[PDB]
Amino acid sequence: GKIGVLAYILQREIHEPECRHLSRKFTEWAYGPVHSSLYDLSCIDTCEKNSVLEVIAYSSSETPNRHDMLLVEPLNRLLQ
Amino acid sequence: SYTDSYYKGQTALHIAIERRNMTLVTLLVENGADVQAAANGDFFKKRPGFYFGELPLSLAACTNQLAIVKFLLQNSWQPADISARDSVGNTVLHALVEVADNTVDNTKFVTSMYNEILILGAKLHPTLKLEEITNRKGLTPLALAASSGKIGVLAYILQREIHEPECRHLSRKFTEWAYGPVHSSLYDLSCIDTCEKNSVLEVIAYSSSETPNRHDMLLVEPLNRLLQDKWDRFVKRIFYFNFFVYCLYMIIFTAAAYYRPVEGLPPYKLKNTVGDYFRVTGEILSVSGGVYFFFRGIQYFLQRRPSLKSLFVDSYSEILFFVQSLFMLVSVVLYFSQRKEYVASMVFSLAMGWTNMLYYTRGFQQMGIYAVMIEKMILRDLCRFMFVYLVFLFGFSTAVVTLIEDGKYNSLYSTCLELFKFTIGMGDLEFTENYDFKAVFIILLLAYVILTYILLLNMLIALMGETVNKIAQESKNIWKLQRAITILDTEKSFLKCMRKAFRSGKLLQVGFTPDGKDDYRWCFRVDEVNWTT
Amino acid sequence: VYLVFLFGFSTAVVTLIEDGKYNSLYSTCLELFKFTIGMGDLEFTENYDFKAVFIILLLAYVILTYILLLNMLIALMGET
Amino acid sequence: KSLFVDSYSEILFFVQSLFMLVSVVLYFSQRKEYVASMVFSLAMGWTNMLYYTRGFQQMGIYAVMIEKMILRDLCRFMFVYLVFLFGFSTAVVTLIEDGKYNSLYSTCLELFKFTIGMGDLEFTENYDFKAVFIILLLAYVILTYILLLNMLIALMGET
Amino acid sequence: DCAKEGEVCSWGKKCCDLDNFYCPMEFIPHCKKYKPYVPVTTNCAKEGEVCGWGSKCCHGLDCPLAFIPYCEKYR
Ligand SMILES: CCCCCCCCCCCCC(=O)O[C@@H](COC(=O)CCC)COP(=O)(O)O[C@H]1[C@H](O)[C@@H](O)[C@@H](O)[C@@H](O)[C@@H]1O
Ligand SMILES: CCCCCCCCCCCCC(=O)O[C@@H](COC(=O)CCC)COP(=O)(O)O[C@H]1[C@H](O)[C@@H](O)[C@@H](O)[C@@H](O)[C@@H]1O
Ligand SMILES: CCCCCCCCCC(=O)O[C@H](COC(=O)CCCCCCC)COP(=O)(O)OCCN
Ligand SMILES: CCCCCCCCCC(=O)O[C@H](COC(=O)CCCCCCC)COP(=O)(O)OCCN
Ligand code: NA
Ligand code: NA
């Protein structure tokens, strides 16, 4: 339930040489006032061992922020 | 130029403006590029995309590239046409209004760009009525802004001031005179009430209710005072007169219905006596009102044509009055058909005929807010509560009837009534009858009562979360909108050589147009006091 | 508001049923008022000509008066 | 521990199915009491319709409020009220041992009726300890309404 | 005039023979006869047997109020 680290990890972005492959948030294209980003959702939907949606949804209810973790940027639109 | 349908019409000028690079724009214009080229691809239409008006001039305007806008209109090689039109029918001002979203920074940008473009256009083409060019739908930029809910743009347009020589005529807010702490401003309200195409009051009042700021757009400075001036001038007396007449109609109807004859088999012969003459007079005066409401309720629909969705969202009272008139007509038909059931219809048209008197609470603020609150809570929360409660009640009624099939519980209707009585608080927890499944029936009734009280308590608590600075503020704007709608409805017909709806008169505002002619603007006077001077 | 509503429904009830405690406006007004304080008489033991219309009128009256009372209560919360 | 605090709808659907199966067993065993099971399976079978309020934005929050206030707040008032009711019921049964109060079950039901506004303060019967009975009933009624009002305001403290 | 057997009562007219017919509560009532007062003698519980849970006490007995009641002779 450490949402502070989850929110960082799911939206990680870096624009350094030999480090761009570590990012999960990228940009596909842009226009003047509008742009289109794309998030890497690897290991969120399917892992076969332990995915983010499964580990959040099926938690023991002892987790403090199990209600708030689903409000992070990619999951809120992925579920919708 | 791109030929693919996705990027159809895109050329180098659009990319140059996109890149915010003046050098390529200058080079393209120098080489004879067509400044009027239209980007007609699906990517640029009003799904993914970005609509800007399809033209480089409106693209520069929409991207806050003021230098490109100035260059394009005034370069020697090929200046752009400020009055150009897109495929939809919009021009630069319409596209600039369209990109507004009522945010602070975007509103500032749109207002500044709009003012600068208007001033430059007036300077280049003094004889061009740039603001009065309608699009395909027939809307001017002011009408479009009012229709789409662009409150930030409307609030600027209605009260703009331009203090520059040869540009003062573009403004519509002026000063008539000044003293020390007190002065008098003068607003030009052309095309606010009467224009014969689509006025601001008409477009705000009779919109589809999809606009998110429909209630806020009447809070601007000129419109609120205009509506209050209209109410206090002639409309108030008309409304009170109509209320008085309706009260007389209901008194006559009630008196005529109360003293109906008790014999069967209508119609009844008229006796040659005074009381029966008064009675039949009352009956005739009761039927005529139903005919009147029937025709008025048709005329409402024909002059609006709602698309079967807003009927139960706005103008509910039209439906209620129409239903009253329908019941009256059915009563007449049953009366002359020699049926006794006409009374069953008549009392219904009586019973709701009093409740529709709440329609006349408007005009009295202290009762209008209360009525708006009643309508808000009924249409919002009690529908959900009634849905859940009715399903629950049906379930327990079919449970009870299956267990006890005699003794007030041999039908679904009687069981439903007997269970509903508990909600009021008039139950029959006696258990004196010798049922086959006693001591199970008790458990069902206790569970039903507990669950129903839990539901009622939940409803009550849920209604408390809407009292925290939510209902109190909203109801006032809704009431003001209702008063505006009835004022417009009264002003619209009036059929008596309208004079009293007019503003201060043909006052000379500037008297010096770009040509030698003068001007008269049909203004509205608003006094003000300010001690910071 | 309540008195006007009560007068309207009382006149409707007196018009529909001209006997059995509903042959006058005063008695009908008292009988309808008693519902507001939880002392109703929804028994329907008498053989009226227009029963099953009378029931609908009484149900509508009760529901509308409880809506009005709930609205009054909620509106009073704007003062605190 | 997880079942008692989460995944209630699965438990309710399972209990519905259990009632249905017991109804079947009683049916084929030549018992009439199968009806008593079947009706229960029906009565809650409609209530579980609330499960399908999710997916709908407006109704789901209303249902969540109902379930949360049932599990959180009312389960304490239930305990307090039931202990109070048991105490006063035993006192009344001790004082008046004949006629509608000779049993604890009937006395509990008769005292419960006051909570829902259908009491009986006629005092027609000639009891031996009348005018003590009146004081007990008045005290019970007043304390009950104080408890209910306090519950209601405490629930205003959560909005 | 008044309604007869099988006719729709309470929608503008009552039934006359109240000593033999009654107008029920079904939202479209039809006047029907009273059933005979037949006593219960079979498929009923005897004194000392369990009451309430699926079987009524016979006509000569009464059922007390309890979770598991037993038929008793009324006084
Ligand atoms: C025998 C059985 C009787 C049953 C009678 C039931 C109570 C009658 C009460 C009569 C009150 C008359 C009235 O004043 O009508 C009420 C309707 O009350 C109801 O909810 C009826 C539910 C059905 C308000 O309707 P209105 O036309 O004002 O619509 C509003 C606009 O004016 C405004 O511009 C806004 O757009 C706003 O969002 C709109 O809502
Ligand atoms: C004949 C006598 C009938 C008796 C019937 C008694 C009322 C029935 C009410 C029917 C409602 C059905 C339902 O929908 O059940 C409800 C729970 O309400 C109750 O049953 C109250 C019982 C006290 C939803 O519980 P849910 O499975 O969604 O678990 C939730 C999680 O999902 C969520 O993420 C959260 O962790 C949350 O804290 C969890 O709860
Ligand atoms: C608001 C609390 C009190 C509610 C009281 C009504 C209980 C629901 C009634 C019922 O569902 O019963 C139906 C009759 O439906 C109707 O009359 C129309 C009712 C439509 C639903 C209105 C919901 C408010 C079957 O009964 P019949 O009249 O057809 O039987 C005669 C011939 N054997
Ligand atoms: C909410 C108001 C009504 C409350 C009523 C409860 C009074 C419980 C008092 C009693 O102890 O009653 C006994 C046992 O109780 C029970 O059944 C189960 C009680 C379970 C608690 C329920 C919590 C609401 C019944 O046994 P009998 O008296 O029928 O004896 C038969 C002789 N062979
Ligand atoms: Na009460
Ligand atoms: Na009561």
Coordinates of N, CA, C and O in Angstrom, one line a residue, chain B residues 340-341 344 406-407 410-411 413-414 417-418 431-432 434-440 442-443, chain E residues 11-12 25-27 35 43 51-58 61 63-67 69:
Chain B
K340 N -71.9 7.4 -15.2 CA -71.7 8.0 -13.8 C -70.2 8.2 -13.5 O -69.9 8.9 -12.5
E341 N -69.3 7.5 -14.2 CA -67.9 7.6 -13.9 C -67.3 9.0 -14.1 O -66.1 9.2 -13.7
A344 N -65.5 10.5 -11.3 CA -64.1 10.0 -11.0 C -63.1 10.8 -11.7 O -62.0 11.1 -11.2
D406 N -54.9 -16.7 2.9 CA -56.2 -16.3 3.2 C -56.2 -15.3 4.4 O -55.2 -15.3 5.1
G407 N -57.2 -14.5 4.6 CA -57.3 -13.6 5.7 C -56.5 -12.3 5.4 O -55.5 -12.1 6.1
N410 N -54.8 -13.0 0.6 CA -55.1 -13.8 -0.6 C -54.9 -13.1 -1.9 O -55.4 -13.6 -2.9
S411 N -54.3 -12.0 -1.9 CA -54.0 -11.2 -3.1 C -52.8 -10.4 -2.9 O -52.4 -10.1 -1.8
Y413 N -52.5 -7.2 -4.2 CA -52.8 -5.8 -3.9 C -53.1 -5.5 -2.5 O -52.5 -4.6 -1.9
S414 N -53.9 -6.4 -1.8 CA -54.2 -6.2 -0.4 C -52.9 -6.4 0.4 O -52.7 -5.6 1.4
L417 N -50.9 -3.2 0.2 CA -51.4 -2.1 1.0 C -51.1 -2.3 2.5 O -50.7 -1.4 3.2
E418 N -51.3 -3.6 3.0 CA -51.1 -3.8 4.4 C -49.7 -3.7 4.8 O -49.4 -3.2 5.9
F431 N -51.6 -10.5 15.3 CA -51.4 -11.9 15.2 C -52.4 -12.7 15.9 O -52.1 -13.7 16.6
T432 N -53.7 -12.3 15.8 CA -54.8 -13.0 16.5 C -55.4 -14.1 15.7 O -56.1 -15.0 16.2
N434 N -55.6 -17.6 13.4 CA -55.1 -18.9 13.5 C -54.6 -19.4 12.1 O -55.2 -20.2 11.4
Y435 N -53.4 -18.9 11.8 CA -52.8 -19.2 10.5 C -52.0 -20.5 10.6 O -51.7 -21.0 11.7
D436 N -51.7 -21.1 9.5 CA -51.0 -22.4 9.5 C -49.5 -22.1 9.7 O -48.8 -23.0 10.3
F437 N -48.9 -21.0 9.3 CA -47.5 -20.7 9.4 C -47.3 -19.5 10.3 O -46.5 -18.6 10.0
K438 N -48.0 -19.4 11.4 CA -47.7 -18.5 12.4 C -46.3 -18.8 13.0 O -45.9 -20.0 13.0
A439 N -45.6 -17.8 13.5 CA -44.3 -17.9 14.1 C -43.2 -17.9 13.0 O -42.0 -17.9 13.3
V440 N -43.6 -18.0 11.7 CA -42.7 -17.7 10.6 C -43.1 -16.3 10.0 O -42.2 -15.5 9.6
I442 N -44.3 -13.8 11.7 CA -43.7 -12.8 12.6 C -42.3 -12.4 12.2 O -41.9 -11.3 12.2
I443 N -41.5 -13.4 11.9 CA -40.1 -13.2 11.5 C -40.0 -12.4 10.2 O -39.2 -11.4 10.1
Chain E
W11 N -66.5 1.1 -8.6 CA -66.2 2.1 -9.6 C -67.5 2.8 -10.0 O -67.9 2.7 -11.2
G12 N -68.2 3.4 -9.0 CA -69.4 4.2 -9.2 C -70.7 3.5 -8.7 O -71.7 4.2 -8.7
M25 N -61.2 -6.2 -2.2 CA -60.2 -5.2 -2.5 C -59.2 -5.8 -3.4 O -58.2 -6.4 -3.0
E26 N -59.4 -5.6 -4.7 CA -58.5 -6.2 -5.8 C -58.3 -5.2 -6.9 O -57.8 -5.6 -8.0
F27 N -58.6 -3.9 -6.8 CA -58.4 -2.8 -7.7 C -59.4 -2.9 -9.0 O -59.6 -1.9 -9.7
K35 N -68.1 -17.4 2.0 CA -67.9 -18.9 2.2 C -68.5 -19.4 3.4 O -68.7 -18.6 4.4
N43 N -56.4 -32.5 9.6 CA -55.1 -31.8 9.2 C -54.8 -30.6 10.1 O -54.5 -29.5 9.7
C51 N -47.7 -26.1 17.6 CA -48.5 -25.1 16.9 C -47.6 -24.2 16.0 O -46.4 -24.1 16.3
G52 N -48.2 -23.6 15.0 CA -47.6 -22.5 14.3 C -46.7 -22.9 13.1 O -46.8 -22.4 12.0
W53 N -45.8 -23.9 13.4 CA -44.9 -24.3 12.3 C -45.5 -25.4 11.4 O -45.2 -26.5 11.4
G54 N -46.4 -24.9 10.6 CA -47.0 -25.7 9.5 C -48.3 -26.3 9.8 O -48.8 -27.1 8.9
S55 N -48.9 -26.1 10.9 CA -50.2 -26.7 11.2 C -50.9 -25.8 12.3 O -50.4 -25.5 13.3
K56 N -52.2 -25.5 12.0 CA -53.0 -24.7 12.9 C -53.6 -25.6 14.0 O -53.8 -26.8 13.7
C57 N -53.9 -25.1 15.1 CA -54.7 -25.8 16.1 C -56.1 -26.0 15.7 O -56.7 -25.1 15.0
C58 N -56.7 -27.1 16.0 CA -58.1 -27.4 15.6 C -59.1 -26.4 16.2 O -58.7 -25.6 17.0
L61 N -59.4 -25.4 20.0 CA -58.2 -25.0 20.7 C -57.7 -23.6 20.2 O -58.2 -23.1 19.2
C63 N -53.9 -21.1 20.0 CA -52.4 -21.2 19.8 C -51.8 -20.1 20.5 O -52.1 -18.9 20.2
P64 N -50.9 -20.3 21.5 CA -50.3 -19.2 22.2 C -49.2 -18.5 21.4 O -48.8 -19.0 20.3
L65 N -48.8 -17.3 21.9 CA -47.7 -16.6 21.2 C -46.4 -17.0 21.8 O -46.1 -16.8 23.0
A66 N -45.5 -17.6 21.0 CA -44.2 -18.1 21.5 C -43.4 -18.5 20.2 O -44.0 -18.6 19.1
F67 N -42.1 -18.7 20.4 CA -41.3 -19.1 19.3 C -41.6 -20.5 18.9 O -41.7 -20.8 17.6
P69 N -44.8 -22.5 19.8 CA -46.0 -22.7 20.6 C -46.6 -24.1 20.6 O -46.3 -24.9 19.6

